[PDB]
Write a protein that binds this ligand. Structure first.
Ligand code: ACV
Ligand code: FE
Length: 329
């Protein structure tokens, strides 16, 4: 009935080092995975994912409805017109099980020129009361830069895998302007589970989130140990096995655009599973004005006539389109 995706485990630790041949061997594995199912697990990544999951669980399980309204994005609180991305994403008991908290670049302050300029997709993060959530903001901001660092190394692997110099992507991935986001998603156990929160796929599978390509350059995802993701292949959807020690990596549609679809953005979905679990993506977005010139690694001259795409416009459109297609999360 349902087969299992080949998701290789790639030791990415050489990407933090200066052994250039070893980096090329990592890049080959990234190339192979990106041309197959489009997913791999980054292992030996150096991030303390036990603390990540512990601190995230403490937050999800202690925040109150009052705090959720106070932090809610505009979709749940009309008072918060500036919160299109960052803030709390409320569940709706009986209708919607998932809930989450999204935050952006901590360097987006009122001082920041993009905030001053009111450029779309830039927002100042909102946070709960420190005394009610001691150490949470400090943990979350540290994690942002921890996973930023891992992502910068992965981008070197992707650049080398495509035959470019290692900073081809990472040079656009900067702490002062990155539009990257962290989302701390809670998927709850519920008995009874609300039928309204379960979607039925065309092929009959019960889903929590429908098929989509990622709005990102790449996505760097930690999940707890409950299998749920499926990737689409020509022979149908295949189960991605869980690994709560590694990061699940895949290309987003910005990468597919700039590589002339040589590295596709894999289509994937979330199966419905009645289990308490965590889904913690880091979406590797560039700066608002970042443009990468497309190329076609299939051609000798590498030439593409695809239009260079400004990352900010891509992100603003992608996030709205994803809400329209797959629902406000
Ligand atoms: C693990 C993923 C598939 C996760 N889904 C997701 O994160 C889905 C699909 S990639 N992503 C989104 O809704 C986009 C959130 C963007 C964020 N608010 C921002 O402003 O940057 C899940 O578990 O549902
Ligand atoms: Fe996704």
């Amino acid at each position: 009935s349902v087969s299992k995706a080949n998701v290789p485990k790639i030791d990415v630790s050489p990407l933090f080092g200066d052994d250039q041949a070893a980096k090329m061997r990592v890049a080959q594995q990234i190339d192979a995975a990106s041309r197959d199912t489009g997913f791999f697990y980054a292992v030996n990544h150096g991030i303390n994912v036990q603390r990540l999951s512990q601190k995230t669980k403490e937050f999800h399980m202690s925040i109150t409805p009052e705090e959720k309204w106070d932090l809610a994005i505009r979709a749940y609180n009309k008072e918060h017109q500036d919160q299109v991305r960052a803030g709390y994403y409320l569940s709706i008991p009986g209708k919607k099980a998932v809930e989450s908290f999204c935050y952006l670049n901590p360097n987006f302050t009122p001082d920041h020129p993009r905030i001053q300029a009111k450029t779309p997709t830039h927002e100042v993060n909102v946070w709960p009361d420190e005394t009610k959530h001691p150490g949470f903001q400090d943990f979350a901001e540290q994690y942002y830069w921890d996973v930023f660092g891992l992502s910068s190394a992965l981008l070197k692997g992707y650049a080398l895998a495509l035959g470019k110099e290692e900073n081809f992507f990472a040079r656009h991935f900067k702490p002062d302007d990155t539009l990257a986001s962290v989302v701390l998603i809670r998927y709850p156990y519920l008995d009874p589970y609300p039928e309204a929160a379960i979607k039925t796929a065309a092929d009959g599978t019960k889903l929590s989130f429908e098929w989509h390509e990622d709005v990102s350059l790449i996505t760097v995802l930690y999940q707890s140990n409950v299998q749920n993701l499926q990737v689409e292949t020509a022979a149908g959807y295949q189960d991605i096995e869980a690994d709560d020690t590694g990061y699940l990596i895949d290309c987003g549609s910005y990468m597919a655009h700039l590589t002339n679809n040589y590295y596709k953005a894999p289509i994937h979905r979330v199966k419905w599973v009645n289990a308490e679990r965590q889904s913690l993506p880091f979406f590797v977005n560039l700066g608002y004005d970042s443009v990468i010139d497309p190329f076609d690694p299939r051609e000798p001259n590498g030439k593409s006539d695809r239009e260079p795409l400004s990352y900010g416009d891509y992100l603003q459109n992608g996030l709205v389109s994803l809400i329209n297609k797959n629902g406000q999360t």
